[PDB]
Homo-oligomer: A and B are copies of this chain.
């Protein structure tokens, strides 16, 4: 199965996020290319519960967390499903990369199809911040761009 999200906003940030999962049990390969970020920085990259763009990136809601856990790093046992960590940006402010994740799926009851991918203005502290905000958003700040995850060929 294949999915795609086109990140857009009015803050100059934009990109594309592709998703690939053969079967439910197999991890999903996430591939991204996002431009217009701050150069040489780490930016929060998350999947939110709703694919609702009626009010900018805010209507996407909280991080997808069907199991009601706290915010963590993608390598953590305790993390939200939509916790993909931080993406690195180069000297030109472009973040290009790829990775696999076993909690993010395009098939089954926890499918992210129809939900939103969000890129942050700030760095995700990965839940290690000494605040309770850290346990929900990683204190990653504003959402300059987002896109609904749709199905593709």
Residues of A at the B interface (CB closer than 8 Å) are: 3-4, 6, 16, 49-54, 59, 61, 113-116, 147-153
Contacts and interface: CB of A to CB of B under 8 A. Distances in A.
A49 B2 CA distance: 13
A150 B51 contact: yes
B150 A16 contact: no
A42 B134 CA distance: 51
A62 B52 CA distance: 23
A39 B4 CA distance: 34
This chain's copy number in the assembly: 2
B115 A52 contact: no
Contact of A116 (B50, B149, B150, B153): B150
A111 to B, nearest CB: 8
Interface centre among A16, A59, A61, A151 (most CB of B within 10 A): A151
A146 to B, nearest CB: 10
